[PDB]
Design an enzyme around this catalytic site. Sequence first.
Site, PDB file in Angstrom:
ATOM      1  N   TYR A 281       0.813  -1.213   0.000  1.00 29.63           N
ATOM      2  CA  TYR A 281       0.000   0.000   0.000  1.00 29.63           C
ATOM      3  C   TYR A 281       0.846   1.261   0.000  1.00 29.63           C
ATOM      4  CZ  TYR A 281      -3.572  -3.377   1.127  1.00 29.63           C
ATOM      5  OH  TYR A 281      -4.394  -4.472   1.108  1.00 29.63           O
ATOM      6  N   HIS A 282       2.077   1.183   0.501  1.00 30.62           N
ATOM      7  CA  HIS A 282       3.021   2.270   0.289  1.00 30.62           C
ATOM      8  C   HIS A 282       3.278   2.465  -1.202  1.00 30.62           C
ATOM      9  CE1 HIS A 282       6.119   5.051   1.710  1.00 30.62           C
ATOM     10  NE2 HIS A 282       6.887   4.579   0.746  1.00 30.62           N
TER      11      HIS A 282
END
Length: 646
Positions: A281-282
Site C-alpha cells: 500500500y506504500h
Amino acid sequence: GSQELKSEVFSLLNLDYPGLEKVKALHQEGKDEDAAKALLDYYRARTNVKTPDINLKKITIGKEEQQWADDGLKHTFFVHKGYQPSYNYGEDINWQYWPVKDNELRWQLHRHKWFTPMGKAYRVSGDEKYAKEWAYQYIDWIKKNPLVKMDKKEYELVSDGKIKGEVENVRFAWRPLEVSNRLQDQTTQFQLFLPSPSFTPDFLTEFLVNYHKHAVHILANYSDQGNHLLFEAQRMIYAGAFFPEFKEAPAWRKSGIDILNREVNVQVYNDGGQFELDPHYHLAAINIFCKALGIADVNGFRNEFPQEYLDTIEKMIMFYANISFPDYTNPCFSDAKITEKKEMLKNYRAWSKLFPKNETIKYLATDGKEGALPDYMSKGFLKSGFFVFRNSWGMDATQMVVKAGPKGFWHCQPDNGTFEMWFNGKNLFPDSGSYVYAGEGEVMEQRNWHRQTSVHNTVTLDNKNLETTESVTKLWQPEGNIQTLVTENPSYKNFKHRRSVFFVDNTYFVIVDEVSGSAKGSVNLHYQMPKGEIANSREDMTFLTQFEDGSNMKLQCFGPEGMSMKKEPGWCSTAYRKRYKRMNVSFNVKKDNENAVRYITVIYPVKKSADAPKFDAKFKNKTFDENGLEIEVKVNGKKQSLKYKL
Ligand SMILES: [Mg+2]
C-alpha cells in the site's frame, strides 16, 4: 447520426483560450455549426495535451480486449469477470437489462470497459466499424441514461413509464465511482477516435457537454474518503488537464490537487512511510499520487501542486527504496506480496521522469549506469517504525529490515519487532506472508494463521497474538561500527518486551530480547527459518545453513537456565495463494515470577557454511535495566562488548 448540435457547449468553453480564436469569432457571428467544426479542427491540430494512459505511436491490443471490442460490436458487453460469457443487451441497447439482481452487474456496465478496446482495435486495424459503432453507443448511452434530480415529493408526481426507470437508473449510471472512471477513460477514447469521420463536430459538442456533466457531478459528490476519493480527485485533475479549454478546468484541477495534498498528510508519516505500514500500500499510494502529478506534469501544471506534495512523494519513494532489498524485492510484511525487479524498474523509470533532479532514483531506474547513491547506509524511519541496516546497496549486501512502529490497521499484523534479513542474493529470514485476502472463508483459518504473532520473528506470551501493537523507539544509532536499534512494546498486560538489534562490523547481528513485567506464562522467542535443509542442534541451540554456497547463515540462541527449543511447522508465502513449508523454531522459557526473561541471539551470515564461527555470549548486568544494557559476545574467541544507555 443521432447526435445533435449542443450549442450550450460554447458557454462551457473559455473561448479566449489560445487556439479557439476561430471558434470564438464564428460563435459571435452566430455560425455555431462552423464554430463546432472549428473546435474539432482545434482538437485535431492540438499537440500540447496528452496523457500517460496511451501512446498513439505504439497502440496495441491483446486477445482479451480484442474479444471485448468484437463482442461490443454485437452489443455483447463485458462488465464483470464473474458474469461470463458476457450478456447481450439487445439491438436497441437496454442499459437497464438486469437478469441477475446484483447491483455490481448493473453498476459495472456503466464502466464501458469495452469502449477503449474498441478504440485500440480501431487504430490497430484501421477498420471504421469500431468508430461508427462506438460513436453510436456513446450517443445511445447519453440519451438512455440521463442525470435527473428529483426528491420524494417530486418523484411521486411522475408520469407512468420510462421516467422512473430513468430516475431509478440514475443511481446505477451515475455512481461517482463509474463517473470518475469514465472521466479518465474517455480521454483515452477521445484520443483514439478523434481522427475518425464518425467524430463529427456535433458529436464533439455532445461529447464535451457530457464530459463536463461528469466533472461537475463528481465535484458535487466527492466520496467519503478511502481510495475512491483519491481516484476521484486524481481523475478531476485528468479532466482539468486534458481539457484545459473549459472555463472550470482550473477549478477542477485545484480541487483535485487540494484534496490529494490534503490526504497525503493524513496517511503518510513525516518520515515518508504510509500509515498502513504495508509495503504494497506504500507502493500503491506512491502510484496513486504520482499518476495525478504525472498527468498534471506532462501538460505544464506541475507548479499547481504545492511543494510539500512533491517532497512528500519524494520521501515516500526514498522510503520504499530504503526498505527494499538489492534485488528490488520488498519485505513481506502485513499483506504485501513480493514485487520483482522488472515492475520496480518500470516504476523507477516513471518516477525518475517525474523527479529528474533526484540522483538516487535516477540511479535505481538506470539500474546502475547513471545516477548516484544516497550519502548514507543504514537508515531509520522512527515515525513509521521501519529500520534498515545495510553494509552495501549492491547485490553483495547484508541488509536487515526491522518493522516496529505504531498501531496499523486491518492490513498490519501483530508482528512488532519482526524483521527480514537479505544476504548476498537471497532472503534468509522471509516473513510468513499473507497468502490469502479477507476473503472469507476456507481460507479463513489460513488467514488468521498467517496473521499470528507466533509466525514471525518476535516474542510471544503463551504463543498468543500481541494485545497491543504500539512500539516505542528507545534508541537508534545508524552509523559507525556498532549500529544499534532499541525498541520496546507493551505486548501484553504487565508485559514489556524490549528488543535490541546490533549490527556489528558490517557483518553480523546480535538480537537481545528482554521481557519484563509481572505477567507469568510461557515466553516464546520465535524465529521463522527459511525453507530447505538446515542443521538442527537442540543441545547447544544452534542452526547452521546447509544450502548451496551463496547465502548461508548460522544462528545461535543464548537463553537462561531451563530454556527449551521447539521445532514447529510453519509457512512462508511470497505470492497470492502460493506458499511453502518451512520451520518455525521457538525458544521457550517458563516465566513463573517477576524476574525478567532475557535472550541473546547471534545471527551470522556466511557464504560457505563451514566458515560459520562458533560464539560466546553473556549478559553483564544482573537483570533487566530500564536505562541501559551491557552484554558481551565472542567471535571464535575474539571478544566484543555491546552496551548502551537510554
Ligand atoms: Mg506477516
